[PDB]
Design a protein around this ligand. Structure first.
Ligand code: PCA
Ligand code: NA
Length: 396
């Protein structure tokens, strides 16, 4: 009977704090399912109290607030490795932070599982100890363009021009770059490609430029505070894009709609998760009920669903390893091949390629309609019709 300790790094203060708090609540939800005995058909690890592979040993976590700062994330990772002696790492939301921190654990030879950082570059580093469960922005951008192509075929090929606007750290830069490359390859004309700092107090120059150019599709990659600033500024300058397809995250912050209210109407984002999938995936309801007891009564959303899924992958790998030895955990992650049966996201399973990326991911697009995100794509998996054009400020 052997316990295991995992380090968990997220932003728990600052502009994206609710993201981090709800992610940690999701991990705590997983720990509740793992460490206690639960009757949940279809969910590995539920029935046993603790991991059968560790003789009933319990998982514990040590949690660090990195504040969105890569250098802090690096320092916290070092302390978790060297002082806390964690046997695996989990985190860390921001691609910038995940990249920097996972380089430390890589060199230490300690497995790092990521639930929700989407820079494509994180899995092209030649690493051996890094495993990512979320789709990355290559996959999510592919989905955006499949949607634009299908809309085009149905609507006279009227979506011709794109405006890309992105925050300037790893995630936003790679997101915007992925979109730009794919645009060029698919014949779409990029008429703005704007980089900005997430901590900026003004986006008025950027919004003026986008309004003047008036792209057919607006493609923002923003964190929470900057997403709010962007939308507030757009309203203030009466900038009315007809289609806004966001790379999540600010647009999937747990409190995005609560904060923005009618300002969010018509916005589209990519996601692997929506509660309107629960008739197709009833496990969502089961886990949601448990999550509420950890989240202060708030429902699952994108980031907690992804973090929960990621942490379950790690837990299952440890169980399968029958060991807390970091090398055996790594090998169990290499060997992992989970079906979709236990999942709360519409992935086909969890199975990593040689680059550490989950091969079985899948995403959706969802649109704010009447105060809730609703699945709109693919057109076969949709809870409602796309609203196009987006309402103008005066109509929201
Ligand atoms: O899907 C997401 C959430 C955070 C952001 C990133 O990788 O920084 N992408
Ligand atoms: Na259990």
């Amino acid at each position: 009977a052997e316990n295991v300790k995992i380090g968990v790094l997220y932003p728990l203060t600052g502009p994206v704090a609710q993201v981090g708090k709800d992610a940690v609540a999701a991990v705590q939800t997983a720990l509740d399912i793992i460490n206690n005995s639960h009757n949940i058909p279809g969910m590995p690890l539920a029935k046993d109290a603790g991991l059968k592979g560790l003789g009933g040993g319990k998982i514990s976590i040590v949690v660090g607030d990195h504040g969105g700062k890569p250098d802090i994330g690096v320092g916290e990772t070092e302390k978790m490795l060297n002082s806390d002696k964690v046997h695996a790492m989990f985190g860390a939301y921001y691609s910038s932070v995940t990249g920097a921190a996972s380089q430390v654990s890589e060199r230490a030879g300690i497995p790092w599982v990521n639930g929700e950082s989407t820079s494509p570059k994180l899995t092209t580093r030649g690493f051996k100890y890094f495993f990512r469960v979320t789709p990355h922005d290559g996959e999510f951008t592919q989905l955006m363009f499949e949607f634009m192509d299908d809309f085009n075929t149905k609507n006279g090929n009227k979506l011709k021009t794109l405006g890309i606007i992105h925050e300037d750290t790893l995630w936003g830069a790679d997101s915007g770059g992925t979109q730009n490359t794919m645009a060029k390859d698919k014949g779409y004309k990029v008429v703005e490609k704007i980089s900005y700092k997430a901590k900026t107090t003004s986006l008025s120059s950027e919004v003026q430029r986008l309004k003047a150019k008036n792209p057919d599709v607006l493609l923002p990659s923003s964190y929470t505070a900057d997403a709010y600033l962007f939308l507030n500024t757009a309203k203030e300058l009466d900038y009315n894009p007809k289609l806004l397809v966001a790379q999540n995250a600010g647009y999937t912050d747990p409190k995005f709609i609560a904060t923005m209210g009618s300002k969010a109407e018509g916005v589209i984002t990519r996601s692997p998760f929506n509660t309107d999938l629960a008739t197709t995936i009833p496990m969502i309801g089961t886990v949601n009920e448990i999550f509420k007891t950890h989240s202060g009564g708030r429902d699952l959303s994108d980031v907690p669903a992804r973090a929960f899924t990621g942490f379950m992958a790690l837990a299952n790998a440890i169980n399968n390893a029958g060991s807390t030895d970091p090398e055996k955990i790594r090998q169990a992650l290499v060997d992992l091949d989970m079906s979709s049966d236990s999942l709360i996201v519409p992935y086909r399973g969890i199975k990593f390629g040689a680059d550490g990326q989950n091969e079985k991911t899948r995403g959706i697009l969802m649109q704010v309609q009447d105060g809730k995100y609703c699945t709109v794509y693919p057109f076969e998996l949709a809870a409602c019709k796309l609203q196009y054009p987006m309402p103008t400020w005066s109509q929201k």
